[PDB]
Amino acid sequence: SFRFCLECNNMLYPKEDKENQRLLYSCRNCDYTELAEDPKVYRHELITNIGETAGIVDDIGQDPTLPRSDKECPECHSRDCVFFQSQQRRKDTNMTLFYVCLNCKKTFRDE
Amino acid sequence: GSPSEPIINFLEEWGMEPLEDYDPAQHTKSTRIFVNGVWTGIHRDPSMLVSTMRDLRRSGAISPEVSIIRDIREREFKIFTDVGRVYRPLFIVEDDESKDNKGELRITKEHIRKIQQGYDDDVYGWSSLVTSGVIEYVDGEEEETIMIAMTPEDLQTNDTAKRIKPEMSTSSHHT
Amino acid sequence: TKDDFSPESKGFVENSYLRGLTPQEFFFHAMAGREGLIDTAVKTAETGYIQRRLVK
Amino acid sequence: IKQKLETQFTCLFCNHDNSVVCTLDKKNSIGLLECKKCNLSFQAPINSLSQPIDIYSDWIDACE
Amino acid sequence: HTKSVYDNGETLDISLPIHPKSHIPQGKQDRWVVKLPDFLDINAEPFDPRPFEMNVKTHEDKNQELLDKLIAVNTVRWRYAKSETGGIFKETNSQIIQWEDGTYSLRVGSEIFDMFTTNTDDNYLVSEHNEEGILMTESTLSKSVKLVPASFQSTTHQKLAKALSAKQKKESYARSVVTKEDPEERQR
Amino acid sequence: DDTITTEDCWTVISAFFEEKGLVSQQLDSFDEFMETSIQDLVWEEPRLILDQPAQHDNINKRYEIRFGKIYLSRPTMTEADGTTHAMFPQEARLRNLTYSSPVYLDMEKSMFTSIDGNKVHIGKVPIMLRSKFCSLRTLDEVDLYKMKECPYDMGGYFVIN
Amino acid sequence: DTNPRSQLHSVERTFDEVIDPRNKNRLQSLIHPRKKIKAVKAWHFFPDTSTFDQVFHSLKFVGSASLSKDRPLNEQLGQVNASILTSLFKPIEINPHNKWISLYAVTDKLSAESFRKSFNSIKDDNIVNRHVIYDHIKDFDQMFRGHKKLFEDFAISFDDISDRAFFVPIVGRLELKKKRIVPGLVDMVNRTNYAHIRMDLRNPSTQETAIRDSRREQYDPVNYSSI
Amino acid sequence: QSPWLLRLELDRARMLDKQLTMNQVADKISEVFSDDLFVMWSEDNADKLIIRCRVIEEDQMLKRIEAHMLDLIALRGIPGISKVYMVKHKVSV
Amino acid sequence: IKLYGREDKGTGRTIKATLPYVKQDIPIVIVFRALGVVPDGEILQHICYDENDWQMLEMLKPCIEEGFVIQDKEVALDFIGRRGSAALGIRREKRIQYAKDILQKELLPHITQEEGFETRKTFFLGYMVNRLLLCALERKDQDDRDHFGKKRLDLAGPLLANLFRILFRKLTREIYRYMQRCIETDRDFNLNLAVK
Ligand SMILES: [Zn+2]
Ligand SMILES: [Zn+2]
Ligand SMILES: [Zn+2]
Asked: Which of B151, D45, F92, G128 is the most buried (most CB within 10 A)?
């Protein structure tokens, strides 16, 4: 996550002080400068799993084309649920199922 | 082809909010509303809206060849009144849970008898069936969101010469 | 329904020609036959061109 | 690196056409327009996305 | 540190005339902005039965006449009611109904229209002073309110559906004619 | 109620084919065209404008013409001797004629000047057979036989030459 | 029901069936057609007499111009603040191409509170001379959209003691976005606006009051027509 | 040297599957980069296998160095041979 | 709206947008500013709809870096106006007016045609860029070209309408030419002769 300038809404690029030895987020369109909280400047994931379970909506139980199972819900122990596979559509994607209860509407696995 | 102005009037009447009053941070769960490919607004209760639009179309208030599509996965609600869309008719199954007729065809023997006679018991043809809500048209894009029984015998749950029908056991129940 | 990997959902015809196909099996079989016709009517020109170059 | 390109622009002093050459140096962020007949030189700063049309428009604005 | 641009200190001695208000909000300077639907109209003028009867317009187009009838019967109005004690009181035909869930509904006669409230930030109401060319703020518009028909069986919804369905049914621009001679006769 | 048999489905399909027929899309599209599309195309660019700042006492003159209503007729045949009569598709087939109808447009001319019009025939449009603008739409079964038209013929085509 | 007599009779029928808000029994008698939920409280819907002469516009900030988002600006003006509720807007236009809005506010909390209390309590004919000084804060770019119909939008204010609800017309909507001043035009910018503006509260003149009453005579002629 | 730090987390399972040693990767980086980059590597027993680096406005320079390192560091094998399979051949002798 | 740059090649993955009557592609940030929304944060607000998705923000970062050179609406419109394929030598104000014309009209005409209605155009541009990013990040499959619900059939009506539009424009041009020729003679033409 990256922060924005509080006065002109531009991006806050990180900057390093030679004399003070501190990491600071500074806007290049002004003189505003705010002290950085964490040193994690950049992170790149070669193999990522985000978007696998992130594709979830709160009204997925109203879809009539989705199959319905009788798996046990971990939270409220309901007897009706709706399952589907991974929303990510790469070639390496697993065939595991995500179950959605019809009362608490949370996503849970079978393992 | 049909004009899109009554569609916009109906949508604005039933709580659709325009784009100028839309904030993506605030509306992290609203549904985008498209009309003929034009993003015209947003809504936060798409279920009531799609139910109202479908009921209006089935009653003849909206033209029967208008497409009403709800993409739940992408949080979109699309409407098409364009010219050139290929459609076909289908029977309507009563899907209301609160109704007693759930899981059954809306068309009855009374409709068949009226069609055979040719008039209503206070001309009764195909259009009368379409505007009575027992038949409706669907195009290829709206077909992606519906669940179709092949025969009316499929709505209710060892011979070497008769063909074998699919079990469809992957789902515990079918609506 | 969505995410169905059963044999009947993805084009397995369990009936014979004597018994008769169901509409889903009929449509899948028509798709396969269309594939066959397209493949023949498309590869004929490439084969003819290869034969002409070989002869010349 | 200086880049020299022949352009079809019209000089506003000599009125001869197809006698305008654009010379832009991306290293020093400068652009030079020289007239092959008038021998006049116009200098204007250039950016990373600069094109000869940018320097030509800058010359037009400077001329008026 | 963005230094303040303006430091001249020049000041205008402008005085604004202000009038007393008939009402004052209590506890919160909040107002709700409501979009006006097509089936609802506002008649700030007092209801005058004789001019209203004398100004009813009849059109050949049934849809336009039905729309005018619906908006006229649904129009928010008010009139002076003579009290039994001899005084005069303002009487209106519109009310606001709040249910047990906390939602609000606008009622005109027997028709009830639900209200959908959406919270809005940094939205205020101002008063324009054109003669001085400045805008004076009034209060804060916290919520935006949309008006929705209560149910299908409401007469307003049925009339709107009928009008919109029969409006697009009438479509005939080209007018037929009979040719008695060769068209090219005028040209030659 | 009672269950719905396959015969009921075939009754519904018979109702469909009784109402629509097999060439309904062609006729409906052509009827939509003739009814509204020609008028809309004419009104797309309804104003031609010519200006002339005459100085030969400066008089700025604008000349402009407006397009009005579209008028259509039933197809007619004009003979060499000058007479006219109603045309029918069998005659057009036999004599290698074109089954088409004249189109008339109202042009209004105005003469604007600042110091500082009836039906014109614009062409003939071929008529699709058995459509709303065809002569065979009204004819019943007997006059259809008298006109040498087959009652099994469905229309949906044009007769050019 | 195309008869004008029928329409008039329907109008009087709608007028007569108004439920008294104090009548709790009749209020509980009313039932939601769909929700099937009884009514709790009621309010009369009335127009406002004292505000029809003035012109009201719905003013909104678009995007980054939000006061909540601008944390130093919000901290300077107070974390509802009376300074925000008593702010002044001054539209100045050098030319048709260049336009902006000037915003002023009261930095002091006590002065803003006193001014707001004095302004919200105007029901008599005695107004104290509150020489309040307004300080410039920020400038924004503006666009305006006009309403074809008069009462396209209306804001509703409530009054619990009288069980009424007063609505006011909205003429247009004003949208504001943050404007970055060009460094080459600061010399002309400094000559346009002012660092301070002093507001003096005075009783309205008789002629202006008569003009405003004449404007209000369109709505209410019983209590405001000139004699 | 520079305050900027570059550490990359490597998957233990696939690193063991390819039968590779952390010291080997460290020597490869040292050879391709000489003394321009100081390198340290966590031992085998670490919960997460990591290997850091330090250079001896340079954030973009470090980003380009990281991209170049990810792109063209060859640990072992013949270049061009993307995958290798084992096959059994029936031969008559 | 093309997405230049191959995976792990070509340095940054810039997003350039092709515009009608414009000779060279344009980065999305510059045209976004030209429509009238300068701050980069609001550009990201229009494009993305969920701040926690750092991957799409990372993919938009090169576009922000490239577009940082332009920071004002008017210079953005001018940059649009230089490449607008018009006659060489047009003045700056006329270039800006030409950019305003080519931006209001012919850029997504199906949305709107009037002035001051570009908010919907900005939202639709954000929607298109969001769809492009969603497909680029392997979150969705590319659209099925052979899907039949995305096709249309033209019957006798539309075909005859297109043909009649072309022929009527030809007839109108002939009427215009005859009128221009006739005004030389200065006669009260019957107007039944201009029409062919
Ligand atoms: Zn900044
Ligand atoms: Zn549950
Ligand atoms: Zn020269």
From this structure: F92
What distance in Å separates the CA atoms of residue G155 and residue G167, rounded to the nearest whole number?
Answer: 5
- Collapsed DSSP state (helix, strand, coil) of residue G172: strand
B32 three-class SS = strand
Residue type at B166 in one-letter notation: P
Domain ranges of chain I: 1-152
Q: Cα G54 vs. chain centroid, distance in angstroms?
A: 9
Count Cβ neighbours within 10 Å for each residue of G126-159 and write b for 16 or more, e otherwise.
ebeeeebebbbbbbbbbeeeebeeebbbbbbbbb
Q: Is D14 annotated as a binding residue?
A: yes
Furthest C-alpha separation in chain G: 71
d(CA E76, CA E78): 7
Q: Report all structural domains of chain A as residue ranges with CATH numbers, in order of start.
A: 1-44 (2.20.25.10), 45-111 (2.20.25.10)
A104 is in an annotated binding site: yes
Cβ atoms within 10 A of the Cβ of B29, count?
10
Residue I22's contacts (CB-CB under 8 Å, 6 or more residues apart) are I80, I83, I84, I85, I102
Q: How was this structure determined?
A: cryo-EM
Q: What is the resolution of this structure in A?
A: 4.7
- D1-64 belongs to which CATH class? mainly beta
Do residues G153 and E36 touch, judged by C-beta distance below 8 A? yes
d(CA I113, CA E108): 38
Neighbours of B76 (CB within 10 A): 15
Answer whether A14's CB lies under 8 Å from A24's CB: yes
CA F48 to chain centre: 24
Would you list the DSSP string of A23-77?
A: EEEE-TTSS-EEE-S--------SS--TTSS----TTGGG-TTS-EE-PPPTTT-
* Cα nearest neighbour of I154 on chain B: B84
Measured distance CA(E179)–CA(H31) in Å, rounded:
97
Distance from CA of E163 to the nearest CA of F (A): 21
DSSP SS3 for H5 = strand
> What tokens were used for G206?
């008789």
**Chains with 3 or more CB pairs under 8 A to chain H:** A, I
Check: CB of residue B104 under 8 Å from CB of residue B155.
yes
Q: Which residue stretches of H1-93 are H helix?
A: 12-17, 22-33, 59-72
C-alpha A21, offset from chain centre: 33
Q: What is the 3-state secondary structure (H, E, C) of chain F?
A: CCCCCHHHHHHHHHHHHHHCCCCHHHHHHHHHHHHHHHHHHHHHCCEEEEEEEECCCCEEEEEEEEEEEEEECCCEEECCCCCEEECCHHHHHHHCCCCEEEEEEEEEEEEEEECCCCEEEEEEEECCCCCCCCCCCCCCHHHHHHCCCCCCCCCCCCCCC
Which residues surround the ion ligand 1 when the cut-off is CB under 5 Å? A 5, 8, 10, 27, 29-30, 32
A90: its two tokens = 């790469």
- Chosen CATH of I1-152 out of 3.40.630.30, 3.40.50.970, 3.40.50.2300, 3.90.1110.10: 3.90.1110.10
Nearest to G165 by CA among G22, G46, G20: G46
Neighbours of G171 (CB within 10 A): 17
Count of Cβ atoms closer than 10 Å to residue E18 Cβ: 16
Looking up tokens 């966590």 gives H42
Nearest residue on chain C to A64, alpha-carbon basis: C1
Chains in contact with chain E (at least 3 beta-carbon pairs closer than 8 A): A, B, F, G, I
* I79: Cα within 13 Å, side-chain hemisphere: 25
Least CB–CB distance from I155: residue in F29, F44, F109: F29
DSSP B164: -
- Residue H6: partners with Cβ closer than 8 Å, 6 or more residues away: H52, H53, H54, H55, H62, H65, H66
User: What is the maximal distance between C-alpha atoms in chain E?
Assistant: 88
Reading the block at residue F121, the tokens are 């025939």
